[PDB]
């Protein structure tokens, strides 16, 4: 009806079942060879792990069940007064794989609103912390001192049937998405407006309004970015290292809590998710080394010479896509109907006609196209949200409703222990040579 | 005059050129393949990851760079009375490949000596967290934020070249280690010993006795017990869930601190680490339904009762050994040396006579012999460290040196991000069909 | 030795040329259309005149010669002990299209001390007023008054030439400006303090810290909310109602006095600037029939009785902003800094997330969105500023700023007389059939 957990009980059996014959049938299919030189290179392009609630195309990017973000975009319940998806109906779909109905959201937003509730020590905690503590590092070490709160671990610590795990990690699950905003808007007022109130939670208001407000910005159009970027940067298959953290925490039966945890520790890691900062400080200095304004012959110019030095242009490239990132797409379509003339911005779509051809001709690119993070930090830098240390935080918020959703899912289909088999260089070589 | 960082400086060099040449002739050759199966079963067998400071053979067990349990008990360099090998010596061997001197392990204890000192704010922190977070929750939170004191974090930041990469690891790896007793010390008298604050290091003596002594212990093999159990946990391949936990966040590289707290995370899995605590939960609740001394078909029953329940037999099962752990041996061995006749470790040999033909008559355990942590809580409990919520802290503070070891070498082998690729089962049962 | 008078001297035969010569190669290009439509509809989006100190972009609000308010409130110079901008270094920006130092601020204040002193014909009018003429009548007539101080008039007498008005309008704007808190604060005193005459200049004060003792009020914050208060409302680009009638009057050759006292006749209107006395007045409305505070439900039902008794909701809507006005947003941050629980401010926040939503589903509005009216009012209350028949005298002293800025510049240009054509419907409706 609208209670999300009892539409997810029915469909648990429907998917065991699938899985079940699917293994029976297909269990022995190879679908992959491994070489030396992936198991040197970080497993890429291993299949290497099942993540359902999204799959990256290399070349069309992101799907959310099936859905591509434009989809989600019209189909996805938006506020009263909105243009934008709001994340519940993303999380909604996750868990699903349907799209909600209004009702449905509505019933999110509620549910997260009334579990929205930090217990005393993480407030004390957060409140000690000293201002050159890292944000990603007070997010960590705050949602570990959350998971005092796990439903799942004290259930299990008292013995439960492993087809029961879902119903408490579900809770958990639920309890932390709806805690996530009053943890991160706690470290921004905490180090970057002397410690006021951060304020109050309006139960008929949603998630990322709650947030915004929290976080002290009144824009509508601020609360609308927050409904899209933390929409797009909730999912991006199981091979991204926070995803895949947090899965592989997740396998030993760690609490949600503890596995979030471990994934905002791979967040906080710089090949991931602090890319966003590193683009605007590569932005920044670029428009004081060629002016404000720079025609489309000496920006050319700077890439080339940037080239050059062997130095890469930060944000573009992937590990995975091959093409254009629907998430920048989609942050440009924002900004040149909301913030067309503002200068960083402007920066950001010249790059976006010179860039790619140029990384084309020099060749190692693979991917000469843009990904999410060429685009997020001129965004939030444009509503007033100057503190770039803070922005991974967005990400991690956003992040917990893809990784958290598949949790669920890990968790109810019985999922085991993440274990592969590792080698030494040494060992190796004896095997190749046997 | 000793330093280890001199030794991986001249190391570093040749295993790079190694595996170059390697990789030259050898990198496009497969070494396995990938099944759905696979897919499915988080990893079983999949060769992922190269991993060079200990391997896991399934039928002999592990070997730290080639020496297995049995060859380290001997040819590891000991304390003056002492019979078990120092950890120490075990980090020595895994980082450098070569059994030290009595003189390098004497300049390790002296180094990891110095290193010791935690700063206010962790101090604050530890002091303030109530007694219902979880000891292994406290010990994650706690090493999250000792990154503010993270070389490397602050290095990257300002464009530090990749070929000093592996020399800032290094110089956080000791200081980790180094405060890791420190942090676990607190934690434990903050518990359990009402906050009493007798802690210091002395300046020439081994890390595992400075543990003990901050423990408030004074048994001479308590220390003995403390200096074999922190080096045989130290390192059990990389495929397990702390060590690739470790190896994943810390290939986005983030600092060793992060990359251990998220391990640590990992680590507290009721299938992982926590298993050591389960066991003796799982005792207690055993012994309370029977005797003290129960007939082989009251075990039966207990253990009956246990996997008719959807639940484990903590303790017992692994993902890659087919046999008994070797380090479950070493740890009986003691147990028949020291404690013998304790009547916890009589249920402990009692159910290693009894739980391996149940589970292979369940199905459901490809191997039905214990692992490490079905044998360490009984040896504590003996010495009258009683609180087994605390048990998997001790596991952390040993499992540090071997991921730190590697995490080192990772840096210096400049192995990339981790980044598998995932499919939906939707996505998989089309590939397939192709 | 710093003169704004000299800095003008240099930029006017700049753009003069700049202009001659855009207009030589552009003056016939078309740059839009005028429909029936838009003649009935006060010629909205018509493109109807140049207006050089300020623009309002329908998408992201005012800029002030190309910047922000956010941009402004970080570059523009600031009281010592003070964090708000100071309107004196705004006029600064509007004039020169330069963000001026702190040492041509302190300039211009030490400039607007000296020439302020009002008449005693002007002082015996306004001494002489009833307290039931409403304070907005009272300043404009005191302003049509004091035109017989101005230089322009007079010289304009005598046939000066058309090469030299810039720098007499120069002078009278400068006059005005600086006599403009005078009028205000005996305006204020005489209704509202029984005539107190505490009302002096500090030689070394910033203009709004004076206007703020003349006021009788000592609150530092009071002072810095009456400095952004000022800079916020200085100019909004050259269509709305005051800036076009000063505009219009002016390009007749009216002095500024007679050009200003015609604007503040226009902004006295419900529809402009008299809309943030209005606010206040429904607050109080509100309030008397509601609690203090009210549901959402009871809100959406007070605003329904006025959109359906043929009343717009004061401070809501905009002739060309579509989306929340910045200086909105801006009085938002300093509400949130300064009085963030206040109990008007939480329902002038609350009506923020209800009044769009309606006005949208009643249909007449373009914009749903607050203009800078919704907030001011509310600022003020709380320092006890509560006669808000006061409020729109504060907005006319800010509005100087702007208008005469332009003023200055209009006849620097040599604008002509500003005179379009009109039509009957009934000569339209012949117009349209031929």
Redesign the interface.
């Known amino acids: 009806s609208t209670n999300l957990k009892d539409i997810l009980a029915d469909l648990i059996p429907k998917?065991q079942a699938?899985?079940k014959t699917?293994?029976q049938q297909?269990?022995?299919?190879?679908?992959?060879?491994?070489?030396?030189?992936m198991?040197?290179?970080?497993?890429?392009?291993?299949?290497?792990?099942?993540?359902?609630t999204?799959?990256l195309d290399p070349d069309e990017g992101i799907r959310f069940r099936?859905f591509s973000i434009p989809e989600c975009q019209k189909l996805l319940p938006k506020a009263?007064?909105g243009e934008e998806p709001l994340p519940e109906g993303l999380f909604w779909l996750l868990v699903t794989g349907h799209i909600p109905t209004e009702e449905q959201v509505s019933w999110l937003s509620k549910e997260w609103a009334k579990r929205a509730a930090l217990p005393s020590?993480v407030v004390?905690?957060l409140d000690?912390?000293?201002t050159?503590?890292?944000p990603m590092?007070q997010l960590?070490?705050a949602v570990?001192?959350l998971?005092?709160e796990s439903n799942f671990?004290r259930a299990?610590?008292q013995?439960?049937?492993?087809?029961?795990y879902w119903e408490l990690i579900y809770e958990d699950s639920m309890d932390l998405i709806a805690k996530l905003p009053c943890v991160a808007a706690k470290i921004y007022r905490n180090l970057y407006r002397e410690g006021?109130?951060i304020?109050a939670i309006?139960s008929?208001?949603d998630w990322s309004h709650n947030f915004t407000n929290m976080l002290?910005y009144?824009?509508?159009?601020f609360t609308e970015l927050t409904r899209l970027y933390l929409t797009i940067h909730s999912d991006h298959?199981?091979?991204?290292?926070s995803?895949?953290?947090s899965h592989?925490?997740?396998?030993?039966?760690?609490d949600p809590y503890?596995?979030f945890?471990?994934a905002m520790?791979?967040?906080?890691?710089?090949?991931?998710g602090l890319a966003n900062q590193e683009v605007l400080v590569w932005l920044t200095q670029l428009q004081k080394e060629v002016g404000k304004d720079v025609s489309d012959e000496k920006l050319r110019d700077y890439i080339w010479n940037t080239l050059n030095s062997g130095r890469v242009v930060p944000g573009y490239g992937h590990?995975?896509l091959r093409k254009t990132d629907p998430r920048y797409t989609c942050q440009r379509e924002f900004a040149l109907?909301?913030?067309?003339?503002?200068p960083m911005f402007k920066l950001v779509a010249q790059l976006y006609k010179i860039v790619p051809n140029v990384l084309l001709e020099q060749g190692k690119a693979k991917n000469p196209w843009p990904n999410v993070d060429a685009h997020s930090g001129v965004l939030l830098q444009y509503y007033?949200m100057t503190e770039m240390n803070y922005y991974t935080v967005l990400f991690g918020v956003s992040r917990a409703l893809g990784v958290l959703a598949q949790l669920i899912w890990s968790r109810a289909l019985g999922?085991?222990?993440?274990?592969?088999?590792?080698?030494?260089?040494?060992?190796?070589?004896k095997?190749?040579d046997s």
């Open positions: 998917e699938r899985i699917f293994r297909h269990g022995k299919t190879v679908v992959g060879q491994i070489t030396v030189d198991m040197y290179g970080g497993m890429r392009g291993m299949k290497g792990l099942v993540y359902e999204s799959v099936g009263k007064g020590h004390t905690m000690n912390f000293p050159n503590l890292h590092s960590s070490a570990t001192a998971n005092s671990a299990y610590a013995g439960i049937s492993r087809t029961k006021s109130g304020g309006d008929n208001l002290g009144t824009d509508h159009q298959e199981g091979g991204n290292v995803a895949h953290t592989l925490v997740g396998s030993a039966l760690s503890l596995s945890a471990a520790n791979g967040l906080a890691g710089p090949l991931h590990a995975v109907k909301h913030l067309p003339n503002d007033g999922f085991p222990l993440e274990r592969p088999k590792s080698m030494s260089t040494e060992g190796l070589m095997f190749v």
